[PDB]
Amino acid sequence: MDEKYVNSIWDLLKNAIQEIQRKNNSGLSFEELYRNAYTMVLHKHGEKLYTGLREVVTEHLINKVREDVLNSLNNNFLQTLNQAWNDHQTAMVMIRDILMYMDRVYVQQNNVENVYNLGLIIFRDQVVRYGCIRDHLRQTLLDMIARERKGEVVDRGAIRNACQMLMILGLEGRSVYEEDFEAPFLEMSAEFFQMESQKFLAENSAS
């Protein structure tokens, strides 16, 4: 139909998506969004919807979770990051479900990644691989694992949650998670264990 009708449909869909992302998915109708997505892709306008999706998702991430992580980099930095990841995942589940139907036609003809993969990629680019968050996360994980290696016990379930989050963030395998985690931790383990062996050769014997 006319461009005004599709623009109004997209505007309403964008408002509904933002409302869902604001932890207000209770009072919102699913059938209307599916029908709106039905008539949007029907008119061969999936490119605009996909482009609008990416802009909305990245704007929400930069506004909400980018500020939240930087505001609490010292007060439960890992706990807040995991909570934001869980909020992103649980919001994407409904976001993906509506747009997986859009994906079924879109990715099989346009040959692009799915919306769930798109959300993981943009989350990786804007949160984990940030110019400041990446180094801060790397430094804090090395510090706590070194303190754990020193002899005192710290939280261990959160570390398992963090590596699992990064493993899912890889989205293809162990490409991003391995390089990001191992390379600083391999070097940290290398120096720590080298000093440990050097200390042991003079303070003890081979018995």
Binding site: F30, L42, V93
Partner: protein, 564 residues
């Protein structure tokens, strides 16, 4: 492999019992006031939308009453029972709404079944409707297969009303395609003109694009001032625009104007000894031998027919059963004039060996052909419906005949045997006795030219010719074909170039077969040498080969590589 089937049936029928007897229903579908008590399990197995509806965490996850809108009760009921009993009763009418709800509910299995139903139901009267349906919902496989059948059929009919209600993108793809089958490039021009003039100025913006896909041989001649008559008043952005616009876009002839009158041959002698037989063709104009696709599963002992719409069909035949070994099958196939392949169609009711395929009133008639029955009606004459894609029995012929030929003259079926002839009247479904021949000859072929029947040859064969007149109802002799003595000519009657020509291959003693065709003078009763087929291009074909008149595209077909 699979798992225990005996429990697979038990659980299936018990779920059906729990569905018809409404007991374990936690979710009910509310559609236009109709109650549909069912389960979340069964809706999940079929549909991929209910998996985003229940296991999603929305308000409907806990709600036990959902108001499913934009659906149909009958379509939902058949989909639900298909998820419950698997019996997908697909008729010829409700498949359109069946696909609509299947795509809405994202039910993959029923989507494939109805697509398989629509891939078989694609025909003349619904080609435009199915293509628009295939354009609305992304069904590329159906869309492409329709487009091919659509491309040939629009050119033939170009008068269906649904052609006017088509999207601009679809029309551009149809018109700019190089698969159109037209004797002239002007019929597509007027088809676009009537489509543009069908509606108001809403076609004006699309006119700058539709002419950009048509060749420029018609973008400077007539049908330019006609649009100026239909132009919106005072519009100076179109008349001048088209004045200086038709410079580019590389005038090039289309592919539909590349059909030539050719002699299609089947069951020819295979060049490579690995295969039994092959199919070739002779070009009376190009003087070359183009190869053809092998018969479906090397279907031997078949019959050919070419409709006035220039369509090739194959019926009957036998396949070597999995040393002599052959089993007769009633499979039916249709030849694609462009893809060089045989598309399967609705099979017959009885198997046939060497059936006489004759087209009349759009129906394909297969008379006799050594049926498997062998009962008192050992003829089994049956026609084929080209619009409904089904076979219907006709009036049985009076006398059982073997090794017979049939032609169509004056909208009637004329079948010929050793000495008798019976004419079938399709309007009343009856047989009437015809004239009796004075010579006992069989194993011959006849060609229908105008209002006369020319029974050429008969028994090897000979040069005996008996001409029969429909208006006169009498058999008369004309002449004998002058051929070399002490030979065994293989006569083949056919109509070509609005004249009665003969494809006669003769073999001398201790000599190879020679190919030569003659033109029979109708008024002078004499066979004149029209053309001599050189052996450098055409090799031996055999004895059980058939010939028919038809048109084919040399571009789609490929030349057969074989030594002279």
């Amino acid at each position: 492999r699979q798992i225990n089937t005996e429990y697979a049936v038990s659980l299936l029928e018990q779920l059906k019992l729990f569905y018809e007897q409404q007991l374990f229903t936690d979710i009910v579908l509310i559609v236009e006031g109709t109650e549909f008590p069912c389960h979340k399990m069964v809706l999940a197995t079929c549909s991929s939308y209910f998996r985003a509806m229940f296991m999603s965490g929305l308000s409907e996850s806990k709600q036990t009453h959902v108001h499913l809108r934009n659906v149909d009760a009958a379509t939902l009921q058949i989909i639900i029972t298909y998820a419950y009993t698997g019996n997908l009763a697909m008729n010829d009418s409700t498949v359109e709404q069946l696909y609509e709800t299947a795509c809405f509910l994202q039910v993959e299995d029923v989507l494939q079944r109805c697509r398989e139903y629509l891939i078989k139901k694609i025909n003349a009267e619904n080609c435009v409707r199915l293509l628009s349906f295939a354009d609305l919902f992304s069904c590329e496989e159906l869309k492409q297969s329709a487009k091919r059948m659509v491309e040939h059929k629009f050119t033939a009919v170009y008068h269906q009303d649904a052609f006017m209600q088509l999207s601009h993108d679809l029309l551009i793809d149809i018109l700019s395609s190089d698969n159109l089958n037209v004797e002239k490039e002007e019929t597509v021009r007027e088809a676009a003109m009537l489509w543009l003039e069908y509606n108001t100025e809403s076609r004006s913006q699309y006119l700058s694009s539709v002419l950009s896909q048509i060749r420029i041989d018609a973008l400077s001649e007539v049908t330019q001032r006609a649009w100026f008559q239909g132009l919106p008043p005072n519009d100076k952005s179109v008349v001048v625009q088209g004045l200086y616009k038709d410079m580019p876009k590389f005038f090039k002839p289309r592919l539909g104007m590349t059909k030539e009158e050719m002699m299609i041959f089947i069951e020819a002698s295979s060049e490579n000894p690995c295969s039994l037989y092959s199919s070739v063709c002779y070009s009376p104009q190009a003087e070359k031998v183009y190869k053809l696709c092998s018969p479906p599963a090397d279907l031997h002992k078949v019959g050919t027919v070419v409709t006035p719409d220039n369509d090739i069909y194959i019926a009957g035949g036998q396949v070597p059963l999995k040393q002599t070994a052959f089993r007769t099958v009633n499979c039916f196939y249709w030849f694609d004039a462009q893809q060089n392949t045989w598309f399967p169609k609705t099979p017959m009711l009885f198997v046939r060996i060497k059936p006489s395929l004759v087209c009349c009133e759009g129906y394909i008639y297969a008379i006799g052909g050594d049926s498997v029955g062998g009962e008192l009606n050992r003829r089994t004459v049956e026609r084929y419906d080209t619009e409904k894609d089904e076979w219907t029995m006709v009036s049985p012929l009076p006398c059982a005949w073997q090794w017979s030929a049939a032609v169509v003259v004056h909208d009637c079926i004329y079948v010929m045997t050793l000495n008798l002839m019976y004419c079938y009247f399709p309007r009343s479904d009856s047989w009437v006795e015809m004239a009796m021949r004075q010579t006992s000859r069989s194993f011959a072929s006849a060609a229908a030219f105008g209002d006369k029947i020319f029974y050429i040859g008969g028994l090897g064969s000979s040069v005996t010719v008996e001409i029969y007149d429909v208006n006169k109802n009498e058999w008369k002799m004309a002449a004998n074909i002058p051929a070399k003595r002490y030979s065994d000519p293989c006569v083949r009657a056919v109509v070509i170039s609005n004249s009665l020509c003969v494809f006669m291959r003769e073999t001398h003693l201790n000599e190879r077969a020679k190919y030569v065709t003659y033109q029979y003078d109708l008024e002078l009763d004499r066979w004149s040498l029209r053309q001599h087929i050189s052996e450098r291009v055409l090799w031996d074909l055999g004895r059980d080969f058939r010939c028919t008149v038809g048109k084919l595209y040399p571009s789609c077909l490929e030349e057969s590589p074989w030594k002279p």
